[PDB]
Design a protein around this ligand. Structure first.
Ligand code: HEM
Length: 291
């Protein structure tokens, strides 16, 4: 099963920078969402969830086809809450109807990371919408109530190794769990809408207690008022993950570089880029543009 990237007709870097900017300006404008966390974190989660359906074995799922727009995937229990990110992006799609759905969802995540002061994430265009019957079944996204061996095995399906897994998980410094969406409640950190390596520092430095939340699920809670999922905490229970947690806790630049690589890879899994495709784009932030 082959998905060849096809550049939206006649478009180039400037066109996609305009879409970036519109997303970034709306992120700035719609500041109140989720008790003033804003839409950055949910856009990052949306980009991951539309990518994380991928299966390396048969190239089903993945970001290419933009299939989140169809009811089966939209209504996946694993995707509860992401409707907010979709609704956010709706007016952007209306303004730029030429961009594919998978390009828009993935670019939303890139824009959020960068506007939250994260690393630059190179991004490639050319995902093409595919029909409703290409939508992957529910159940391809990961469970939170599991251990390190689960996490490691899960991510093999997305062709991610230990370092890539631990780097990607650093996104859990962003935003929060919401009891109504996932059966977990609380923020992972103090800087909910700024991208840093706080996830790793908090895992190592906080005093975590294994408690039950109001949905009768176990989660790790700190006296500082933070939480970790069982799968997050597994990164300090497994010796191989722990070494990499310590590395990123002690080197902000290394985390940023490794995250950027793993996140681009996640967003591009399943896609074949022609040898004469454009190079990946690196978008300027609003701040860099004086906007
Ligand atoms: C073992 C893997 C993972 C599990 C089990 C998992 C699970 C969860 C759960 C249960 C939530 C809360 C959803 C809600 O209640 O609103 C969540 C939030 C989120 N996840 Fe993950 N996740 C995993 C990996 C990732 C990865 C790879 C990324 C992206 C690089 C990511 C990004 C986020 C973001 C940013 C949030 C916050 C969303 C918000 O504030 O609205 N997750 N995740």
């Amino acid at each position: 099963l082959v998905h060849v990237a096809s550049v939206e007709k006649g478009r180039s870097y400037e066109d996609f920078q305009k879409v970036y900017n519109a997303i970034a300006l709306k992120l700035r404008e719609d500041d109140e969402y989720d008790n003033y966390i804003g839409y950055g974190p949910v856009l990052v989660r949306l980009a991951w969830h539309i990518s994380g359906t991928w299966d390396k074995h048969d190239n089903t799922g993945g970001s290419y086809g933009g299939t989140y727009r169809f009811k089966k995937e939209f209504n996946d229990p694993s995707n509860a809450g992401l409707q907010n990110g979709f609704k956010f992006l709706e007016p952007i799609h209306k303004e730029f109807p030429w961009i594919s759905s998978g390009d828009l969802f993935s670019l939303g995540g890139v824009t959020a990371v960068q506007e939250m002061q994260g690393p630059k994430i190179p991004w490639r265009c050319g995902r093409v919408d595919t029909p409703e019957d290409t939508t992957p079944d529910n159940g391809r996204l990961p469970d939170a109530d599991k251990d390190a061996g689960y996490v490691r095995t899960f991510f093999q399906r997305l062709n991610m190794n230990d370092r890539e897994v631990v780097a990607l998980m650093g996104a859990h410094a962003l935003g929060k769990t919401h009891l109504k969406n996932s059966g977990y409640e609380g923020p992972g950190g103090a800087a909910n809408n700024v991208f840093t390596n706080e996830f790793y520092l908090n895992l190592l430095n906080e005093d975590w207690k294994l408690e039950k939340n109001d949905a009768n699920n176990e989660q790790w809670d700190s006296k500082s008022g933070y939480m970790m999922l069982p799968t997050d905490y597994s990164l300090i229970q497994d010796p191989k993950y722990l070494s990499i947690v310590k590395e990123y806790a002690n080197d902000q630049d290394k985390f940023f570089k490794d995250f950027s690589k793993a996140f681009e890879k996640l967003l591009e899994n399943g896609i074949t880029f022609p040898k004469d495709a454009p190079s990946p784009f690196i978008f300027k932030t609003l701040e860099e543009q004086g906007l």
